[PDB]
């Protein structure tokens, strides 16, 4: 069963998403928003400067987009990331620790950009199923059975680890290679409103300062 | 001392070899997540008033005679509802749509009327070219008929190959 | 938080440590502050006072 916010659109309409940057971005992260713009299909990159979060939200519900991807950084290393579904939908502020930008490596080429398959591992919690259904709808519906790039979202040890892979299938085994970013990622708060709202109801919030904080998983 | 939060995961090669060997298992089995498109009589105990001679006559002699009269009552009521409902919604006066056996003459005649009925149908729609009934011939969609005996084997190849890709599609 | 650790290297042996206060709020100590040799930034769960005394349990 899909989430109640995503229920009307779920398979019918393709999403259209916006990757935008915090405020006067460093030239490292302004590259890194383009890897997010490439990791999804139907993603455009609008450079942000002297926009407010109201009139960038309110001029996006108007034009009609599914959601909004905004990034932050520390000294060129990108740190944070939010996805916020627009028609009064939820938001998910992610902290992302271990990044490797694609422009560091080599001029190996350019990505496939075709509709990806996905891989969601180790999501057992009901809050884990929220993060499933809020990440999954950022991709265009119904990928082909033999499309060649697959995007894994793996959850070992409460850090959702996402990698980008291409694959080909040999005479015996599948052989893969990596393109695109390495993330670790961690959600830490989940509002029911958009990222504009700032007083919406908090579905989940990473409590740090609790006697059993380190004990549980998805807590 | 005790730390206050989970340490950020360290990506060893051991982690990735646990990860890319998961992806090969889900690609090769092709069980992976994706956003699929959204597509698009009870017998009556009560005694039958109709006699055995009468029931046979009905068999001897729209969807149902009772159901159509249900449909005809219920559309006469709905057009009464739209009028009163329509009047409140409308900002201008609206006349009642309706006020609810011998030959019946239509007040307004639809279409050209003088023009013949045959003219309205398109030429394409009264003859599509079709595959011939004999096995010994093949007729194409444009009207280029081909027998099976005047073909060459290399033309036999392409036509079976052409009817392969259209049937496969 | 000042004058708990002497050097900026001493803090780095102890980062990630579950610091608590008198008032009963928790936290962690995260990075050794550089420009003075001793101090460090520490994220608590709520706003610490000035009148308040942090204590790190140890054995």
């Amino acid at each position: 069963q899909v989430d109640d916010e995503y229920a009307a659109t779920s398979g019918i309409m393709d999403p259209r998403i916006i990757v935008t940057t915090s405020r006067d971005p460093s030239t490292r992260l302004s590259q890194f928003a383009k890897e997010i713009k490439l990791l999804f299909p139907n993603a455009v990159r609008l450079n942000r400067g002297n926009y407010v979060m109201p009139n960038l939200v309110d001029a996006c519900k108007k034009s009609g987009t599914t959601d909004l991807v905004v990034l932050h950084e520390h000294r060129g290393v990108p740190t944070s990331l939010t996805i916020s579904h627009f028609p009064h939908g939820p938001t998910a502020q992610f902290s992302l620790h271990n990044v490797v930008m694609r422009h560091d490596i080599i001029n190996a080429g350019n990505q496939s950009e075709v509709n990806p398959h996905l891989i969601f591992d180790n999501f057992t919690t009901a809050l884990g199923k929220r993060v499933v259904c809020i990440l999954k709808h950022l991709f265009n519906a119904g990928p082909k059975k033999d499309s060649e790039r697959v995007i894994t979202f793996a959850n070992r040890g409460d850090f959702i680890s996402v990698r980008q892979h291409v694959y080909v299938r040999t005479r015996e085994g599948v052989e893969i290679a990596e393109v695109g970013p390495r993330f670790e990622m961690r959600l830490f708060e989940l509002r029911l409103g958009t990222l504009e709202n700032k007083d919406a109801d908090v579905e989940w919030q990473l409590r740090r300062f609790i006697r059993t904080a380190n004990k549980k998983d998805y807590l | 001392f005790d730390r206050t939060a989970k340490p950020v995961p360290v990506i060893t090669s051991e982690v990735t070899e646990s990860l890319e060997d998961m992806i090969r298992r889900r690609i090769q089995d092709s069980n992976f997540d994706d956003l699929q498109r959204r597509t698009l009589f009870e017998l009556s105990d009560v005694k039958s008033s109709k006699s055995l001679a009468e029931i046979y006559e009905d068999d001897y002699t729209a969807l149902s005679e009772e159901l159509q009269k249900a449909h005809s009552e219920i559309s006469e009521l709905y057009a009464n509802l739209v009028y009163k409902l329509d009047v409140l919604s409308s900002v201008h006066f609206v006349p009642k749509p309706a006020s609810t056996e011998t030959p019946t003459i239509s007040m307004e005649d639809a279409q050209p009327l003088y023009m013949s009925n045959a003219s309205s149908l398109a030429p394409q729609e009264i003859y599509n070219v079709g595959k011939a009934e004999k096995d010994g011939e093949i007729r194409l969609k444009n009207g280029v008929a081909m027998s099976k005996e005047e073909l060459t084997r290399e033309d036999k190849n392409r036509l079976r190959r052409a009817l392969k890709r259209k049937r496969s599609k | 938080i000042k004058d708990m650790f002497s050097s900026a290297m001493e803090v780095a042996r102890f980062e990630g440590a579950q610091i608590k206060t008198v008032s009963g709020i928790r936290g962690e100590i995260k990075r050794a502050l550089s420009k003075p040799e001793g101090h460090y930034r520490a994220a608590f769960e709520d706003k610490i006072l000035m009148s308040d005394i942090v204590i790190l349990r140890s054995w």
Binding site: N214, K215 | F1, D2, R3, P7 | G16, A17
Partner: peptide
């Protein structure tokens, strides 16, 4: 390194704790 020890033993001394408790209650 001490974080990965202080966490892992404290998880063992709770994961061994509920087993030793629930073995009391059922008996």
């Amino acid at each position: 390194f001490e974080a990965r020890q202080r966490i892992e033993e404290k998880n063992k001394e709770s994961s061994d704790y509920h087993a030793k408790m629930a073995h009391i209650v059922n008996t």
